Amino acid sequence: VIKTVLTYQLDGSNRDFNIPFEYLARKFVVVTLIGVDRKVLTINTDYRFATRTTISLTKAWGPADGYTTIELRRVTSTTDRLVDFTDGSILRAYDLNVAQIQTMHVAEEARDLTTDTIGVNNDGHLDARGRRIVNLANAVDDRDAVPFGQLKTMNQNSWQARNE
Amino acid sequence: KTVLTYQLDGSNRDFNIPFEYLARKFVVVTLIGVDRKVLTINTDYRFATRTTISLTKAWGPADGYTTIELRRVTSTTDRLVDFTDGSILRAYDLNVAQIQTMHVAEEARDLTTDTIGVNNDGHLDARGRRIVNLANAVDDRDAVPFGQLKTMNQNSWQARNE
Amino acid sequence: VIKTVLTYQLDGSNRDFNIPFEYLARKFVVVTLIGVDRKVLTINTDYRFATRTTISLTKAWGPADGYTTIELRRVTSTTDRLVDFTDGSILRAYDLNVAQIQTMHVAEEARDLTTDTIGVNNDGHLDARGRRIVNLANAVDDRDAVPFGQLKTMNQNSWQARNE
Numbered sequence: 459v460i461k462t463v464l465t466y467q468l469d470g471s472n473r474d475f476n477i478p479f480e481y482l483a484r485k486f487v488v489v490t491l492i493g494v495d496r497k498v499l500t501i502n503t504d505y506r507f508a509t510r511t512t513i514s515l516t517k518a519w520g521p522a523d524g525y526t527t528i529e530l531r532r533v534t535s536t537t538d539r540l541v542d543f544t545d546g547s548i549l550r551a552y553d554l555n556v557a558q559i560q561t562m563h564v565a566e567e568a569r570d571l572t573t574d575t576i577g578v579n580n581d582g583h584l585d586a587r588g589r590r591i592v593n594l595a596n597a598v599d600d601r602d603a604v605p606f607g608q609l610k611t612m613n614q615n616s617w618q619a620r621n622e
Numbered sequence: 623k624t625v626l627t628y629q630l631d632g633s634n635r636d637f638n639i640p641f642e643y644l645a646r647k648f649v650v651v652t653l654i655g656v657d658r659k660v661l662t663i664n665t666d667y668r669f670a671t672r673t674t675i676s677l678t679k680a681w682g683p684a685d686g687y688t689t690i691e692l693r694r695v696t697s698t699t700d701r702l703v704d705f706t707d708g709s710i711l712r713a714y715d716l717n718v719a720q721i722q723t724m725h726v727a728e729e730a731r732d733l734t735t736d737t738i739g740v741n742n743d744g745h746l747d748a749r750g751r752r753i754v755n756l757a758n759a760v761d762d763r764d765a766v767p768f769g770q771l772k773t774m775n776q777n778s779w780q781a782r783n784e
Numbered sequence: 785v786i787k788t789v790l791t792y793q794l795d796g797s798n799r800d801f802n803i804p805f806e807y808l809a810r811k812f813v814v815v816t817l818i819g820v821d822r823k824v825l826t827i828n829t830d831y832r833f834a835t836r837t838t839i840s841l842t843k844a845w846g847p848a849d850g851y852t853t854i855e856l857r858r859v860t861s862t863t864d865r866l867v868d869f870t871d872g873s874i875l876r877a878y879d880l881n882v883a884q885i886q887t888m889h890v891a892e893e894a895r896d897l898t899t900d901t902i903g904v905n906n907d908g909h910l911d912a913r914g915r916r917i918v919n920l921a922n923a924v925d926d927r928d929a930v931p932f933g934q935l936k937t938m939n940q941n942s943w944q945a946r947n948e
Contacts, residue, residue, distance in 0.1 A: 460699075495908070496908065536787070536888055536889075536891070536892050537787075537806065539884065539885075539888060541884075542881065543877040543880045543881050543884075544877055545877050547877065549875070549877075549880075550707065551705035551706050551707050551709075554705045554716075554719075554880075555704065555705055557884045558701065558703070558719045558723065559701075560888070561723045561884065561887045561888050561891055562698055562701070562722075562723055562726065564888060564891035564892065564894075564895065565698070565723055565726035565727045565729075565730060565891045565894060566698045566726065567895065568727065568730035568891060568894040568895040568898050569698075569726070569729060569730040569733060569898075571895060571898045571899065572730060572733050572734035572898040572901075573733075574903075574904075575734070575737075575898065575899065575901060575902070575903030575904065576737060576738060576901060576902045576903055576910060577737075578737050579754050579755070581754075582751065583751050583752055583753070583754040584737070584738060584748070584751055584752070584753045584754070585753070585754055585755040586753055586755045586756045586757065586910055587755055588755060588757050589756075589757055589904070589908075589909055589910045590756070590757040590758065590759055590760070590761075590764050590765065590909050590910065591753075591756070591759075591764060591765035591902060591909070591910045591911075591912050592761055592763060592764050592765075592905070592907075592909045592910070592911055592912065593763045593911060593912055593913070593914050594763055594764075594765060594912030594914070594915065594916060594917065595763075595818075595912070595914055595915055595916040596763065596916075597820060597821075597916045598932050599821075600918050600919075600932075601931070601932060601933035601936070602748075602917070602918070602919075602920060602921050602931035602932045602933050603916055603917060603918075603931070603932040604765040604766060604917060604921075604929050604930055604931065604932065605762075605763055605764075605765070605766075606759050606761065606762055606763060606764045606765070606766050607762045607763065608932075609766050609771070609774075609930075609935065612775070612935060612939055613774045613775045613778070615939060616775040616778045616779070616938070616939045616942050616943070617775070617777075617778045619778070619782070619939075619942055619943050619946050620778040620781045620782040620942060620946065622946050711875075712871075713869035713870055713871055713873065716869040716883070717868065717869060720865075720883055720886075720887050723887045723890075723891065724862050724887065724890055726891075727862070727890050727891050727893070727894040728862065728894075730894040730895075730898060731893075731894050731897055731898075734894075734897055734898045734900075734901055735897075735901075737901065738901055738902060738917075739901055740900065740901070740915070741918055741919070743821075743822070743918070744816070744822040744915065745915060745916050745917075745918035745919075746901070746902065746912070746915055746916065746917045746918060747918065747919050748917050748918070748919055748920055748921045749919060749920070750919065750920035750921070751920070751921060752921050752922055752923060752924065752928050752929060752931075753921070753928060753929035754925065754927070754928050755927065755928075756927065756928060756929045763912075765912070765917075765929055766929075766930060767926070767927055767928065767929060767930070768923040768924075768925065768926045768927065768928050768929065768930050769926035769927060771923075771930050771935070772926055775935065775938050775939065775942075776938075778942055779938050779941070779942055782942045782945050782946055783945070
């Protein structure tokens with residue numbers, strides 16, 4: 459019910475932001491300014507956790523700089539798992555809880571990401587929202603595809619056929 | 623697998639549940655007819671037997687609803703297993719925790735594949751649809767909209783019509 | 785963003801490609817030469833793990849064979865567990881580590897598949913991941929996408945028209 463993307467609005471001078479979701483480590487919260495391009499931001503110079511679930515921006519970051527949204531995302535690192543059971547440890551239940559929480563967080567981040575990929579139009583048609591598809595195989599064993607190179611070549615073919 | 627729809631077929635009561643669910647609340651049933659509406663538990667459903675749900679009312683197409691659903695929604699904020707120090711650490715708890723996480727992962731997988739998804743031959747399944755919104759293509763491998771083509775062989779398709 | 789699916793351009797006579805993703809078992813690593821069609825190799829007959837994190841193809845497999853990229857991929861069997869806890873077991877640390885690793889890896893696979901379908905890539909453009917839209921599709925509005933069959937008809941009708 460709680461997503462992990464939270465595309466916000468810069469709307470000029472607004473330095474505070476909220477985190478509806480919950481995270482394990484500070485590093486798992488990734489915030490990238492959005493606009494003409496996307497840029498990741500660092501800690502102690504762009505972020506500051508004023509309080510749990512409160513990101514503070516050091517610079518005003520209005521649209522003048524060329525950005526429109528913040529998109530607070532949660533990304534739990536997989537390689538850097540929080541807990542690694544050792545041979546001589548005591549096996550506190552806290553370790554098991556932390557591990558299970560981390561895996562659940564990764565899965566939840568997965569469901570939210572798929573709703574953050576290609577959308578579908580209300581009428582039942584795929585919608586690219588003004589984007590352009592790229593690097594799609596120009597294989598035409600079937601009757602349908604949509605690459606650009608063979609389009610150009612067969613455009614040349616049809617054009618010279620007409621010129622005939 | 624997780625998402626399975628059934629045609630109402632006028633009057634019917636029972637419907638099989640293919641997938642596995644750790645808790646009753648996870649199974650979600652929606653009347654996807656004129657509008658997709660959920661139904662409450664122990665009011666419109668009565669489960670009945672593991673792997674089977676029971677509807678209290680017929681709910682035929684004449685009632686305004688054509689199809690139902692058995693989507694699984696495993697909770698991500700509530701954990702069926704919550705380990706504590708003062709416990710015998712039953713293995714079934716360990717297995718249940720892992721299975722719950724895998725179930726959430728499968729939910730994500732099927733939700734992604736709900737829209738355009740890969741084919742058995744590693745191909746995108748548009749499923750007889752068209753990409754209504756598509757920006758201009760300016761690369762060799764890009765997907766060309768219809769206007770850009772209108773500024774190409776379309777001219778030729780008319781220049782040869784005369 | 786994807787970390788468990790890497791695509792390397794074959795480049796004629798090359799055979800070594802590293803595996804940055806951590807695979808629990810060899811059988812969970814699949815290599816699929818992408819070309820005119822996707823081909824799947826086998827262990828000890830087409831390629832071998834020269835050592836951990838690297839695979840040596842037996843043959844060059846360059847573009848001359850119609851395949852351009854290798855696209856080695858990770859897939860962890862969700863149904864089959866590498867570690868299953870029993871009642872009278874001994875609970876080795878390795879067992880807990882393996883269970884947690886497998887769960888986290890399947891979550892990674894979920895995220896990878898989330899991004900595999902057409903979605904925003906690093907450059908910010910919907911990416912076909914070198915794959916081909918295959919079953920049906922037709923154009924109607926000038927702003928929509930075009931199937932290949934429509935263009936084929938547009939060309940062949942013009943050709944036969946000229947042929948009169």
